[PDB]
Design a protein around this ligand. Sequence first.
Ligand SMILES: Nc1nc2c(ncn2[C@@H]2O[C@H](COP(=O)(O)OP(=O)(O)OP(=O)(O)O)[C@@H](O)[C@H]2O)c(=O)[nH]1
Ligand SMILES: Nc1nc2c(ncn2[C@@H]2O[C@H](COP(=O)(O)OP(=O)(O)OP(=O)(O)O)[C@@H](O)[C@H]2O)c(=O)[nH]1
Ligand SMILES: Nc1nc2c(ncn2[C@@H]2O[C@H](COP(=O)(O)OP(=O)(O)OP(=O)(O)O)[C@@H](O)[C@H]2O)c(=O)[nH]1
Ligand SMILES: Nc1nc2c(ncn2[C@@H]2O[C@H](COP(=O)(O)OP(=O)(O)OP(=O)(O)O)[C@@H](O)[C@H]2O)c(=O)[nH]1
Ligand SMILES: Nc1ncnc2c1ncn2[C@H]1C[C@H](O)[C@@H](COP(=O)(O)OP(=O)(O)OP(=O)(O)O)O1
Ligand SMILES: Nc1ncnc2c1ncn2[C@H]1C[C@H](O)[C@@H](COP(=O)(O)OP(=O)(O)OP(=O)(O)O)O1
Ligand SMILES: Nc1ccn([C@H]2C[C@H](O)[C@@H](COP(=O)(O)OP(=O)(O)OP(=O)(O)O)O2)c(=O)n1
Lengths: 458, 458, 458, 458
Amino acid sequence: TMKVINDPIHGHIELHPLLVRIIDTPQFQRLRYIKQLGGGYYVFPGASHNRFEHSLGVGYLAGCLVHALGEKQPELQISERDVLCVQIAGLCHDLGHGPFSHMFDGRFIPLARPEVKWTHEQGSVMMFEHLINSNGIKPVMEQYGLIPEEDICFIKEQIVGPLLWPYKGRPENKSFLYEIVSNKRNGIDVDKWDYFARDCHHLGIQNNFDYKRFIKFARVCEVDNELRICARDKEVGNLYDMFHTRNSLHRRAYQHKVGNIIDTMITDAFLKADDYIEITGAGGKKYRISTAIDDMEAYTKLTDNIFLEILYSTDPKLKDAREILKQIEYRNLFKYVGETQPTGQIKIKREDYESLPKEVASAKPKVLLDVKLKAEDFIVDVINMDYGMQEKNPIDHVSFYCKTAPNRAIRITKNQVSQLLPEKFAEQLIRVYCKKVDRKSLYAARQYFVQWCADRNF
Amino acid sequence: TMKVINDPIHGHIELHPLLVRIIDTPQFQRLRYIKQLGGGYYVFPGASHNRFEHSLGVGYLAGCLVHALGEKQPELQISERDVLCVQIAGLCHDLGHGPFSHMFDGRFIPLARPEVKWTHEQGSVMMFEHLINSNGIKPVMEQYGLIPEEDICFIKEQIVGPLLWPYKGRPENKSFLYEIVSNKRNGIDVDKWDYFARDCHHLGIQNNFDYKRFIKFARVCEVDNELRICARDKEVGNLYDMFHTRNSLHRRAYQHKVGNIIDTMITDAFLKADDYIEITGAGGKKYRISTAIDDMEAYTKLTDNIFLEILYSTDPKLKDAREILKQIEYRNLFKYVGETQPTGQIKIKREDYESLPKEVASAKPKVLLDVKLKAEDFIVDVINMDYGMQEKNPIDHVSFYCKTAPNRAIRITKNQVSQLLPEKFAEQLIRVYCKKVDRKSLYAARQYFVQWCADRNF
Amino acid sequence: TMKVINDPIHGHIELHPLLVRIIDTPQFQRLRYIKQLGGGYYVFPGASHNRFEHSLGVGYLAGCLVHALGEKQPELQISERDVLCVQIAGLCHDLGHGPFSHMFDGRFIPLARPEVKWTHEQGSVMMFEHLINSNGIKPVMEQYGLIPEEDICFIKEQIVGPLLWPYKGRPENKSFLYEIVSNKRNGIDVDKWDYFARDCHHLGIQNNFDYKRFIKFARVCEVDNELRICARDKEVGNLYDMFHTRNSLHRRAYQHKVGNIIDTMITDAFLKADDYIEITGAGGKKYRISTAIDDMEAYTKLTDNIFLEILYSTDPKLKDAREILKQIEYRNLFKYVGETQPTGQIKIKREDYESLPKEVASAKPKVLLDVKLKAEDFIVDVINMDYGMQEKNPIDHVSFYCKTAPNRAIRITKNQVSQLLPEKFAEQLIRVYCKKVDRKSLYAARQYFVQWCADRNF
Amino acid sequence: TMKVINDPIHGHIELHPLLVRIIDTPQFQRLRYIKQLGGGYYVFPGASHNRFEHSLGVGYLAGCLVHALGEKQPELQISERDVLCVQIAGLCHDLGHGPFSHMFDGRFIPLARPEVKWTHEQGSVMMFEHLINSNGIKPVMEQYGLIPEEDICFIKEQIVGPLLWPYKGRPENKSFLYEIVSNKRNGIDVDKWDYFARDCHHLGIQNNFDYKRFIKFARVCEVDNELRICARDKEVGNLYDMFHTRNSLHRRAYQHKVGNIIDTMITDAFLKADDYIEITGAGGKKYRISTAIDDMEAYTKLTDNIFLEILYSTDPKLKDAREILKQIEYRNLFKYVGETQPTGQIKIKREDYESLPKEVASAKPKVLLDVKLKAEDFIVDVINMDYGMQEKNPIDHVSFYCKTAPNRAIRITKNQVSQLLPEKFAEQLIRVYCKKVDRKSLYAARQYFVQWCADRNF
Ligand SMILES: Nc1nc2c(ncn2[C@@H]2O[C@H](COP(=O)(O)OP(=O)(O)OP(=O)(O)O)[C@@H](O)[C@H]2O)c(=O)[nH]1
Ligand SMILES: Nc1nc2c(ncn2[C@@H]2O[C@H](COP(=O)(O)OP(=O)(O)OP(=O)(O)O)[C@@H](O)[C@H]2O)c(=O)[nH]1
Ligand SMILES: Nc1nc2c(ncn2[C@@H]2O[C@H](COP(=O)(O)OP(=O)(O)OP(=O)(O)O)[C@@H](O)[C@H]2O)c(=O)[nH]1
Ligand SMILES: Nc1nc2c(ncn2[C@@H]2O[C@H](COP(=O)(O)OP(=O)(O)OP(=O)(O)O)[C@@H](O)[C@H]2O)c(=O)[nH]1
Ligand SMILES: Nc1ncnc2c1ncn2[C@H]1C[C@H](O)[C@@H](COP(=O)(O)OP(=O)(O)OP(=O)(O)O)O1
Ligand SMILES: Nc1ncnc2c1ncn2[C@H]1C[C@H](O)[C@@H](COP(=O)(O)OP(=O)(O)OP(=O)(O)O)O1
Ligand SMILES: Nc1ccn([C@H]2C[C@H](O)[C@@H](COP(=O)(O)OP(=O)(O)OP(=O)(O)O)O2)c(=O)n1
C-alpha cells in the first residue's frame, strides 16, 4: 500500500508501492553510509547528511514538477506510467557514488587509474541494472503497467543521456521529459534545487532560490521544432540570482581550503592503502579499491567504512596510511602558502597538473635563505569556478514566453535585463601547500612561491 | 527598573530605564501609525509593520555592536555614557517620516513645495529637540551621568551629520562612533541589517547577510590618522554578497510597478486634498498638509490616518480625492504601457521629469490609428538603481586587516577578488503609464511609446 | 484570469477569478484596517497584522482540505461548484468584526446596548448580503456555474449555522461540507490552524501543531447515519497536543494582564465618546457607534480609525475620552492588585460582573489603614479558560478509524490513551485592578482584596 | 588563539584555546562515529547527527549560563577559572557512550553481562581520565591558571556526582555550580535544552521551550542554607510546558515501535556476534565487545563501525548475525501483535522481564486455532514514561522568587497554578511482538495475547 515518510526539508513525502519495493534493497540502502559533502564535515560540524535522503527528495521534486505540468496543460498527454518512470529516474540518479562522494571520482580514480574514463553516472547506470536484475523487480514493474523493455532504456537515458532525434525511450513529442531530472542543455533541474535547500539547511547558510515560484510559472512550448520547458519572461532576474547563489555556495563551502586539504590527505592515505585492502566479488573473486568499479557486487560493499577500517587496523603493511589518518585526527594538516589571483586568460589543462610542483620547486629565490625544499614538499590545487557550462552564459539557452502570447517562446539578451550583471562566466585560481611545519620551512616556501608567481604574471 | 520586550526578529530585547522614559512619549508613539513600506502593502499582504519596531531593533543592534567593540579592545576606552548615547541615537534616527514613509518626502513634498529642500533626517532632528524640550527629559539625562549640552549635540551629529575634524560631539580619538548608526562614507551600518532582516521576515523573501559573523570579525584600526572600523580581509565576498542582496531587495519589492503606481495615485489624491484639510499646531494656528513640516506640534498629528479621513469624508470639496481613493479600492489602476532598456551612459536629471509626458505626447506614430492622446494622459516614472554611492564602488572605501598583523589596515582591489563581479555600479530606466485604460488608448499609447523610444535611442 | 498572491505563512496562493472579483470591494477591503489581536499590539510589538491576510489564509486552507478529500475518495462526488462555495464561505467568515476585533463584541457592545444579543457572525451574514447585493456579484456567480438561490443559503449556513436534517444548502449526503470552515460539534477546522500559525509567526512564540499530517490521514466515514470526517486512530495524542497548544496560546498572549487592562481603558474611552461621534448611513441618516450595527452602510466605515479620530480631536465634548487615550499614550495604566486561585466549582455568571466591584469595596479590613476607597475605584475581570466546549472533553466527539478497516468509525476513551492527560476541561479566575496610583492606595486596595478573597473561600 | 565554529543551532561559537586542545584528541574525535538517536535513523531519515555537535552545544550553553549569572550578580564572585571548568565539564559529559548511544547501555550490556552495574557516565569519567593522562593536558591546564588536583575532581563531580556537604571540588558557597551541566535534584539543565533544540531541528518536529527567556529571569538565592538557582514566580507555566514537551518528544520519537524493534534486532545480532569479534587493547591484550568496558584503549575503538564490519564479513562463524542484519536491510522485521493499556498501579520490576514471554506463551485461547507458538516466538518490551523523577512532581523541587523581594525564595503548589495540569507523573505499558511472519501465525499470536491481557486485568 501507500507509504509516508517525514522529511525535514519537504515535509511528508508519499511513496508509490513500487518505489517502496525498489528502496528496500541492499544496493539502495548502501547510500546510508556515503556522506553528501565528504570532507566538509571536518569544517562544518552540521553537515552529517548522506545521499539517501537527497535521493528521496530528488524523486519527490521530480514527481511534483511532472504533476504540475500535467495539471496545467491537459493536451500534453502525460500518463501515470511517465510519472512513475520519471520518479524512478530521479530516485536512482546517484546510485554510483563512491566513498566520500565527489572525492572518489574527482581525486582518487584519476590518480589511481589514469588509463580509464569513469564518472559516477556510468556507475549509477551499472548499479541500476545490477539492482533490477538481482532483486527480481521485473515482474513487479510488469504488475503496475510498465513495459520494461522501453521503460528501462528511458530511465537509463534520463540518468546518463543518449546511449536527428537521438533518444530511444520516448518519441520526439515527449522531449520535455528529459529536462526534469538532469538538464544537459542549460543545467536547470530539480537536483540543484534539492541540494541547494538541503546543504543550506544543514551547513547553517541562508538560501535564496524559490523553486515553488518557478514551478508556478513553468510551461511547455514548441521551441524550434521540439517541446521544451519555458519560463515566464519576468523570471530572468530570479534565474540570474539562482546562478549567483550556486556560485556563492561553491565558493563558501565546496572549495574551502581546509576541507580540500583534508580531502587531499584522505586520498593520499587511500592511495597508500591500495594493494593491501581487499574486497570480495562475484564468485569468491578478489578485487582492489581502485579495481572495484569493474564488479558491482564488490562495489556494493565500498562505503565510508574503509576510513575506519584503515584507522583501526593493526596489520604492519598499512602503517603509512594509518599515520596519515592519525595525523588528520590530531589536526596536523598541510599548511597554506599562498594562492594565485584569478584569471580567465591563461588556462592550465588537465594534463599539466603533474608538473606544477616541479615548477614551484625549481625556482631561484632572490633573497638568501638556507632551508631548501624539494618538489615532493608541495601540493598544488587548481579550482575552476564557472556557471556550469564552460564560460557560456546559460541564460542564453533558456526560452521565455509573454503573458499576452503564452504559446510562443522568445529569447532575452543580457543587455535587455540589467547592467550590473557579470561580464564573464568562468575563472581559475591556483593554491599552493607545504608539507613541512617548521617555522622556517613556511618562510622558505613563501619565498619560493613569490618567485614562481611573479615569474609568469599570475 | 530594567524592562524586557519580545521581538520576533531579535528575540528578547533589554532596555535601559532612560530609553523606557524616552519611548513613552506622544512624539515617539506616533511611529505606531506609519507603515514601513508605504504602498507595498497593497501588493505584499504580509508587510503590515510600522517604524516603531524597526527603531527598537536599530537601537538594540547599535548597542550590541558597541558592546562587542568595547569587549574585544579594552584600550579604546568606551564608557557606558557612550553606549547610552549611541543607543539613543539609534532609537530616534527615524522620528521624522511622514505618512507612508518614503512616499511623503520622495514624491509629495517635491511636487507640493518645490522651493524648499527637506529630508526626513532634518525632521528627525527637529522632532528630537521637540521631544526632549517638551517631555522634560533633561533632568532625567542628568540623573544617569549624561552631560546634555555635549550629548545632545553628539546625538544630533550621529543622526544628520556635521551641523579638519568637523564634528563637535566627540573628539578625534572617538571617530569610530560616528559610523555605527549612520555610515556616510561606505554605507555599512546596523540600519541596513535591521531592515534587511525585518523586510525579509515579513515580505516572505529569503535573506542572505549574516551580520553576526560580521560583528565577530570587526575591529578598530588607525586608518590614515583616524580610527575606523575594519573588516577581516576574507570578508570581501560577504560584503559583495550583501550589496547584491540589497540590490535584489530593491528590484523585487521596493520598485514594484503596481506599488509605485499606487503610490502615484495616493500622492495625486493628497495633492488634490491639500488646501482643504486643517491641522492645528502651537498657539491654535492652522496648517496645511504641505506646510505642517514647519511646526512640530502640527506634524505630531500627521500619520496614515489622513488616508482614511479622506476616504470616509463627506465634504463636497474633497470629492476628487475621494474619487481617486475609491478608484484604488476597486483596483481600477493606471495601466502599464512600457519601460525603457537600462542605460548608465545618458542620464535624465532631477529637473527634467516635468517635460517627459510632453515629449511622449508630441510624437508621430507611423501607423494610422485614430485615437489620439494628450500630455496629461501619461505618467513617466524614472528609477535609479545603484550600490548606494552614485556609481562608486563602495568596497573601495573599506579598510581590511590581516590575521598576522591585526593592527595594520590595507586596501583590496576588485580584480584581486574575482572576475564574476559587476563592472559598473549604477543604471537608470524609465517607465510609462496610461491613464485611460479603456480598450484602445493602450494600443494608441503603446504606438506612441514605441515611436518615442526609437526617437532618442532608448 | 487566474491570480497569484504571496503569503509569508502559506507561500504562493492561487485565486479563482470569482474570488478576485469578491475581494475587490469596499466591504472586503475594510478588513485592512482592523487588527487581529486588538490591544495585544501594545504588549507584543510584532503583532501588527490584520484580518485581511487571515481571511485569505482561511480560504486557501479550506480549498486545500476539500481538494484532498475529493482526490482521496472519488466516490464522495465533490464537484467544483462545492469547492468554490466552500472557498467563498472560508473567505467571508469574518466580514463582521468591528474595531479592535474581539473587544467590540466582547466588552463594548454588552456594556453599551445590554438589551440586544449580537455576535460578529450575524454581522458577517449581514455584510455578506450587503456586499453581494451592492456590488452586482449575482450575474458573475451565474457565469461560473453557481445557482445563487441555493449557494448563498449554503454559504450562510456554513458561516453562522442553521438559519431531522436541519440544513438547507446541501442534502444529507453532503454533511461533511458543513464542518470544514466552522465546526460546531468538536471545534476542529481550518480557522484554528490558520490563526495558530499566523499568531505564532508574528508574536514570536513557537507552534507545535502539524495540520499537513492531519490532512494526510483524514477520511470521510458514516458515523451514525451521516457522513463525517474521521481521523486515524493513532492521531489522538496529536489532537490532545493541539488543544494543549490552544490553551497555552490563550494563557500566554490572549489573556495578558496589561493587554486586558489596555482594552478596558479603550472601551471606557469609547463609551465616553459615544453620543458625540457620528456616522452617516444610507439616505443621509445619522448613527452612533453603538447603533451602527443596524445599518451596514454606516458599519462599513467603522474601523480602528475611531481611535486616532478621538485622539486627534479638538471638540470640547470629547475631552474625557481624549484624556483616557492620552493616559494610555504615557503608560499611566490601571494597576494590578491581585488575582484569585482558579476554581472549577463555584461559578460567577455574566449577570454578576456589574455587582462584583460593590462586593469588593464593601469589605472591612482587620488592620487599620486610613485611606478608604469607593466601588468606582475597582475593575474586576473574570477569565474563563476551557477546551472550547464548556467543560466537555472535545475528543469524546471525534470519530476514528483503524488501518485494517478504514470504513468503520470507532470511539476512543481517554483512559485508553494515557494517564498524564488533564482530568477537567474548564476553570475560572478573577482579577482586580485599581484606578488610583498613590503608593498608599495600592496598599489599601491590597488589604481590601485580601479581606474579600478570604470571605468566600477564593 | 581563539577559534570559531559555525553551528546550525546556536550559530557561531567561540572556543578557548584549552578547549581546542582538548577537542583535538582521538578520545574526543571518537564521537564523530556514534549516532545520537541510534535506531531512530531508520524511521526518521533526517536524524543522522552524532554526539560531537551535541557536546559542543552543551559546552557553549553552559558557558552562556555561567556568564549571565556572573554578569547580573557580581557578589557571587565567579572567576574565569570556574567558567573554564564548567565549560570543560559540559564538553566531556558524554565521552562514555557506546555504539548506537542508548542501545548499548540500555539493552545490550544488561543482557550480555548481568553481574555488573554500568552506566555511560561512569564510562565518561573513565574516558576523561584516560584522555587527560594520555594526551599530556596537565601542563596545559597549569598554563592557563587551573589547579589540576582540585579542578579535575570538580569536573568529575559535575559529570557523575559525589564520588553534610558531600562534594569536594568547590566549597559550600559555590553550590549553584553543580546544577548547570547536570541537575540531579529537579532535572533542569542545559543538556535538555540542547537536545530538545537539536532533535527538533533534525527530526522535523516543532519545539516549545524558550531557554533564552529562562536565562533572562534566572537568579541565585539562598533556599535552605545553600545557594541555588531560582526562577521568576511567573515562569511556572513555562516549566510545565517544558516537561510536557519532553514527554511529547519521548512518546513521538524516542519510543517509536519500529525503531524499538530495529534496536531489538540489532542487539540480538550483536549478542550472536559476541565471542567471535576481537578488539585489541593496552599491552596487545584482546577483548570482546561486552568486556571492552574494562580497558579504555580497546573502548576507544568501539563505534558504529561494528555494524558494517558484521554486515560485510565473510567468516563462517558470523553467519547468524549477518542473517539478522540482512533481514533488517530488506525490511523483514518482527511484527507487532498488541500493546497493553497504560496503568500506574501494578509495576513490573526490572528482574521480571525474563519470564514474560513464558507467561504469554503458556495461555489457553478459548477458540480453536491449530497453529501453536513457543515462548521463543515472542518479544515483550516494557516502556516507562514519567517526568524524570519517578512519579514525583519535579516542580515541587523548584524555588521561585517575587519581583518585590528578589532575594527571598518561595514554593508554589500545583493547585495555585491551574486545574488543567496532570494529576500523576508516571505510567507504564507493555508491547508484544512476534518473530513468525505469516498469515496464520499473526492471528494465533493475537489470540494468545487477548487471552493473556485478560488474565490479569491489563
Ligand atoms: N520501508 C521503509 N520505511 C522507512 C525507511 N526509512 C524510513 N521509513 C519510515 O519508517 C516507517 C516504518 O514503517 P515500516 O518500516 O513500513 O514498518 P511497519 O509500518 O510496521 O510495516 P507495515 O506493515 O508495512 O506497515 C515507514 O512508515 C516509513 O515512512 C526505509 O528505508 N524503508
Ligand atoms: N513601557 C512600554 N512597554 C511596552 C511597550 N510596548 C510593549 N511593551 C511591553 O509590554 C510589557 C507591559 O509592561 P508595562 O507596560 O511596563 O506594565 P507593567 O509591567 O504592569 O508596569 P510596571 O509596574 O512598570 O512593571 C512590558 O514589559 C514591555 O516589554 C511600550 O510601548 N511601552
Ligand atoms: N487584485 C488584487 N491584487 C492584490 C491584492 N493584494 C495583493 N495583490 C497582489 O498584487 C499583485 C498586483 O497585480 P494587479 O493588482 O492585478 O495589477 P496588474 O497585474 O498590473 O493588473 P492585471 O492586468 O489584472 O494583471 C497581484 O498579482 C496580487 O497577487 C488585492 O487586494 N487585490
Ligand atoms: N581544530 C578544529 N577545527 C574544527 C573542527 N571541526 C570544525 N572545525 C572548524 O574548521 C576550521 C578550520 O580551521 P583549522 O582546522 O584550525 O585550520 P587552519 O585555520 O588553517 O589552522 P590554524 O593555523 O590553526 O588557523 C576551524 O576554524 C574550525 O572552526 C575540529 O574538530 N577541530
Ligand atoms: N510566555 C511568553 N513568551 C514569550 N514572550 C512573552 C511571554 N509572556 C510575555 N511575553 C512578552 C510580553 C512582553 O513583550 C515581554 C515581557 O512582558 P512580561 O514578561 O509579561 O512583563 P510584564 O511587564 O507583564 O511583567 P512584570 O512587570 O511583572 O515583570 O515578553
Ligand atoms: N520576486 C518575487 N519573489 C516573491 N514574491 C514576489 C516576487 N515578485 C512579486 N512577488 C509577489 C507580489 C504579489 O504578492 C505576488 C504576485 O505578484 P506579481 O508576480 O508581481 O504579479 P503582477 O500582477 O505584478 O504581474 P502580471 O499581471 O504581469 O503577471 O507575488
Ligand atoms: N566540487 C564539489 C562538487 C560538489 N560537491 C557536493 C555539493 C553538492 O551537494 C553535491 C552535488 O551533487 P552531485 O553529485 O549530483 O553533483 P552534480 O553534477 O549533480 O552537481 P551540478 O548541479 O553542478 O551538476 O556535491 C562538493 O562537495 N564539491
